[PDB]
Structure 1
């Protein structure tokens, strides 16, 4: 309506909708962050597995 309680309610709702959308937008980028971070660590751990396996076979050929 042409009220004034309506105008303040619309303004407060617009504030609330913007806040709720920016919050939900970061939670989706936060999940996208974890994908790039877990892919970083899983590739570091995979290099560590190869490193340890290499040194185990180097150490085991001392038996020859």
Structure 2
């Protein structure tokens, strides 16, 4: 077209495009930050599982050394 209506629609779409690109770029930043939070939580849970597993294994071996 390349008329007055075309120039107006292109101006509005260029604004919407930049706004949509900003939203996606921000969503990628929140996703990267969420990986850091989940990784720290994952390391805390691994240490807790390891601690309880050793505590349960020691108690189980303690019960198995018991006579009839």
Q: Give the TM-score, by structure 1 length.
A: 0.65
- Which stretch shows the higher mean deviation, 5-14 or 23-32? 5-14
SS of residue in 1 equivalent to 2:2? coil
Query: How many equivalent residue pairs?
Result: 64
The CA distance in 2 between the partners of 1:38 and 1:6, in whole Å, is 47
Does residue 31 of structure 1 match 2:31? yes
The structure with the largest alpha-carbon Rg is: 2
| Structure 1: gaps (5+ residues) | none
> Secondary structure of the residue that 1:63 maps to in structure 2?
helix
The 1-side partners of 2:38 and 2:2 are apart by 54
- Residues 54, 2 of structure 1: alpha-carbon distance in 2 compared, 3 angstrom cutoff: closer
Post-superposition offset of 1:11: 2.6
Displacement of 1:7: 4.3
Runs of 4+ off more than 2 Å = 1-11, 60-64
